[PDB]
Amino acid sequence: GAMGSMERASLIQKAKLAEQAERYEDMAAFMKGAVEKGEELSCEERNLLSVAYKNVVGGQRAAWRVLSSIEQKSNEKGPEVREYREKVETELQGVCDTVLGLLDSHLIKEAGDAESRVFYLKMKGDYYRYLAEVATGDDKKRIIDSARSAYQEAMDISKKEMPPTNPIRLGLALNFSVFHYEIANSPEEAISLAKTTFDEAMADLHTLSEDSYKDSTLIMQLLRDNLTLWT
C-alpha cells in the first residue's frame, strides 16, 4: 500500500501530527499503514486508530442521515437525491469494510491482553453496526448477527477479565445497549444492559483507575442519559 515504504515510528508520528491538524482521513491512512507493519498496537496507538476512523465514518454517517431524511421527505422529483445518498452510502461502506478488514487480517487475535481483545471486538461490533444503519435485505440480517456476535464475545471477555468501571468495558456496554435500541428493535435488552452496567460500576466505584477515571465517569453519565431518554 501507499504507506509500505514508511517506517512504523514515522507513520505513528504523522498520525499524531494529522490529529493536531484535524486531517482525520490522513490520520486513518497513517494508522492503516502502521497496522499493516504487522506489530501489535499499544493503548495509545489504538486511540489514534479509533479517533481517526471514527471521525471519518462520523462525517459520512452525518452526511448520509441528512441525505436520507431529504430522500424520505421527497418520497412523501428526479433521481438526484437517491443517487447522491447512494454515493455517500458506498463510501461509508468502503470505510467500514477497510476497518473490518484490518481487524480480521491484523488486530483480532486469540492471544493479547484483555484490553486489546475487548477493544478490537467492540470495534468490530461498532463497524458492523454502522453498516447495519444503511443496510437492507439478505446483506442486512448477515450484518446484524455479525455485530451482536462480536459485541457478545467482547462482553463475555470484559465481565470475566475487567473491573466494572473499566472504560473499554463501559464503552462496549454503552455501544451494545445502542445496538439493542437503535438496530435490533429490543428496547428491553437495551434498558436492562444499560441499567446493570451503570449499577455495577457504581457498586464497585472503588475500582476506578487513576489514569482513566474521567473516561469511566463520562461513560457512566452517558448510560444515565440514555436511561433518561429511554425513560
Binding site: 486511540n47 479517533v51 462520523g58 445502542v178 473516561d215 431518554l229
Partner: peptide, 11 residues
C-alpha cells in the same frame, strides 16, 4: 432523538 454512543474522546 438518537441514543448517544461512546464518544470520540482522546484517551
Amino acid at each position: 432523538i438518537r441514543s448517544t454512543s461512546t464518544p470520540n474522546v482522546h484517551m
